[PDB]
Paper text:
While AMPylases from various pathogenic microorganisms have recently been characterized, the only virulence protein with de-AMPylation activity known to date is the Legionella pneumophila effector SidD which catalyzes AMP removal from the host GTPase Rab1. Here, we present the crystal structure of the de-adenylylation domain of SidD and reveal the catalytic mechanism of Rab1 de-adenylylation. Instead, the catalitic domain of SidD is remarkably similar to that of the metal-dependent protein phosphatases (PPMs), however with distinctive structural features to distinguish AMPylated Rab1 from similarly modified substrates. The finding that SidD is a PPM phosphatase with de-AMPylation activity constitutes a clear example of how L. pneumophila has adapted a common enzymatic fold and mechanism to effectively hydrolyze an unusual substrate.
Numbering used by the authors: 37 to 84, 88 to 269, 277 to 351
């Protein structure tokens, strides 16, 4: 492949966490963390399945940064999902960045990419059923932008250099549905796209993108609820920025806030001394937007292989 992958996590073994460390190639700008927040207690309140999440972070051959955040539906399909991302999604990213540069309407470019992903999934990976968000940088008018999307329940937030956190891709919930890259959702792709997230924004070097699968739901807030005709309620869920401040990286603070909450949940759960079951796979990725010097260094690195 031509893209530079600086961090990748293909699931994590039951009972284990994964901490990627930094990659010197991108000066510590990218990292992954992956832990299960699944809590499963017997009647006596004692503790009793591999992760299906995948994150990929890297840079195109042109130095443009991307993050892909994926959560598979079913354990027995995890390899099909993981393979589909490597074989079919990753190779699209360079041309997505180039098209975003070259065409006027980022929304049309992104929509077209989503249709293409659904097409390839149906032609080449029927067992790859998953939710996914992604984003890539691109250069236009001597500025740097970031565009992408999310279908399903994964999220991407950004903490800007001055400290404000905003949501780029929300966790979308649709009454009675599970919108995803799957056979079911592929019957009405444009409706799925309109009720999930597409984004395009200006970014500056040092702005920090944080992608995530599942967070404990009391850490989110409802940014919007709306009715969709096909008579269904859609909710867009954001990371509640009240749990964060301006000083530390958002990746750092998310892991802290989740850990502290999960500690409370596990303690509550044990002390009820009853059956409890809740939580899911938690995987988080960090991508700091590169400056022009690193972008150049990456382009050169990609040439030599
Ligand atoms: Cl471990
Ligand atoms: Cl399963
Ligand atoms: Cl595949
Ligand atoms: Cl590639
Ligand atoms: Cl293209
Ligand atoms: Cl646009
Ligand atoms: Cl857009
Ligand atoms: Cl399709
Ligand atoms: Cl398959
Ligand atoms: Cl430019
Ligand atoms: Cl949003
Ligand atoms: Cl849903
Ligand atoms: Cl449709
Ligand atoms: Cl706030
Ligand atoms: Cl710069």
């Amino acid at each position: 492949m031509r893209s530079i992958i600086t961090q990748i996590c293909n699931g994590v073994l039951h009972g284990q966490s994964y901490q990627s460390g930094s990659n010197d190639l991108d000066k510590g700008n990218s990292e992954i963390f992956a832990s299960s927040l699944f809590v499963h207690l017997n009647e006596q309140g004692k503790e009793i399945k591999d992760s299906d999440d995948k994150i990929v972070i890297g840079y195109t051959k042109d130095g443009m940064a991307f993050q892909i955040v994926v959560a598979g539906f079913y354990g027995c399909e995890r390899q099909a999902v993981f393979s589909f991302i490597d074989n079919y999604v990753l190779p699209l990213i360079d041309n997505f960045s180039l098209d975003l540069t070259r065409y006027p309407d980022s929304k049309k470019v992104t929509e077209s990419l989503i249709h293409t992903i659904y097409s390839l999934r149906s032609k080449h990976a029927p067992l790859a059923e998953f939710t996914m968000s992604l984003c890539v940088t691109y250069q236009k008018d001597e500025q740097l932008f970031c565009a992408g999307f999310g279908i399903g329940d994964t999220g991407i937030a950004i903490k800007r250099n001055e400290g404000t956190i905003e949501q780029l891709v929300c966790h979308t919930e649709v009454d009675g549905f599970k919108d995803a890259f799957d056979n079911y959702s592929s019957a009405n792709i444009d409706l799925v796209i309109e009720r999930n997230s597409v984004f395009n924004t200006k970014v500056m070097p040092g702005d920090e993108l944080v992608g995530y699968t599942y967070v404990p739901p009391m850490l989110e807030m409802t940014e919007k609820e709306f009715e969709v005709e096909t008579k269904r309620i859609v909710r867009h869920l954001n990371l509640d920025p009240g749990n964060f401040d301006d000083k530390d990286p958002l990746f750092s603070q998310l892991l802290q806030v989740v850990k502290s909450k999960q500690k409370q949940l596990v303690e509550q759960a044990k002390e009820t001394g009853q059956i409890q079951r809740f939580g899911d796979d938690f995987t988080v990725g960090r991508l700091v937007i590169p400056d022009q010097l690193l972008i150049n260094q990456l382009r050169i690195h990609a040439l030599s292989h």
